[PDB]
Design an enzyme around this catalytic site. Sequence first.
Site, PDB file in Angstrom:
ATOM      1  CB  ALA A 132      -0.998   0.000   1.169  1.00 39.66           C
ATOM      2  CG  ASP A 133       3.657   1.445   3.152  1.00 43.66           C
ATOM      3  OD1 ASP A 133       2.671   0.721   3.283  1.00 43.66           O
ATOM      4  OD2 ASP A 133       4.513   1.528   4.053  1.00 43.66           O
ATOM      5  N   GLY A 134       3.542   1.974  -1.251  1.00 43.76           N
ATOM      6  CA  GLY A 134       4.110   2.276  -2.542  1.00 43.76           C
ATOM      7  C   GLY A 134       3.300   3.263  -3.353  1.00 43.76           C
ATOM      8  CE1 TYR A 136       2.378  11.292   0.431  1.00 43.86           C
ATOM      9  CE2 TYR A 136       4.640  10.601   0.491  1.00 43.86           C
ATOM     10  CZ  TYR A 136       3.725  11.584   0.637  1.00 43.86           C
ATOM     11  OH  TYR A 136       4.069  12.866   0.954  1.00 43.86           O
TER      12      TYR A 136
END
Length: 354
Positions: A132-134, A136
Amino acid sequence: SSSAEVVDIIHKVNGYWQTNHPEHGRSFWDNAAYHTGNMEAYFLTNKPEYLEYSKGWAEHNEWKGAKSDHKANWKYSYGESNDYVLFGDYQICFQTYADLYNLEPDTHKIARAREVMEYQMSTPNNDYWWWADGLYMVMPVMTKLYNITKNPLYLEKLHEYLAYADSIMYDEEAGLYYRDGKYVYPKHKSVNGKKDFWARGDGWVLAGLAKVLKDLPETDKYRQEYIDRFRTLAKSVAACQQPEGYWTRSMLDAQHAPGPETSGTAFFTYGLQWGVNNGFLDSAHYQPVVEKAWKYLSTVALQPDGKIGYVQPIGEKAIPGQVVDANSTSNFGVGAFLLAACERVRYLESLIQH
């Protein structure tokens, strides 16, 4: 004035961070995330020292992420070494390099960013954004590089890569993203049987979508899909805010990992306020949520010397019953806080001066 008070907080926070970190480190995501916040503070306040701090970091890192020139060794699973050129944690630095380029254009500032992303886009793979962080880390790279190059492939690949991530991590029923494909219900649950959505994970996504919508051309053929997802995610985020104004580490299960956490909360406070301020989110519905969140950030997370506490640490070991260290700060937590604070200034300055 309410806005001036938040500007003073921004300078206290960013000053604390820069004072305590005079030397620059690597281009990897945690430092790079801070720089996204520093750049926001520079755009808001024009304080020259902030620009200089990001320029110094970019120069230290030679305007590159991971350094390998051996494309056959380039990897995109997790790694911190120089072969991990295609891993989005080594590409968020490009956001800052692009921002610095826009202020003072020079080919070398974005040479590596373009080399890497253009090679990536030439490959057939669709699965670069597998956590998920990818979102951003890399979605705003695509929009920033589009606005510089006007190469439409950036916007096509933004869609292709996000569509992959969404297909694996978005839970349509809950309206939230799992941190990665291993955390999906019902195989995985929180300790009390809820769906387990990591707050910082969803924070990255909501903030990332805000940054996409900030810079994407109004005519882009996929824009409505991004807006639609931003709205669904915002609604589900708002619905699971704790009464105290923060979001817990497991967003839907406060007892799994109890008590305040700052980084998710800060990213949400940015993304929700940004969406209200930019006409994508319902003002009346979301402003009260933002107000409770800012209350937490300004009263509980913020310390009077400018330290940002209650940040869930990268190395955390935790079990139910245990809270985050009040004195836990980080580069990425400060970055998130700065995003939230800057967007709050923009909201406050919109209000009538009586």
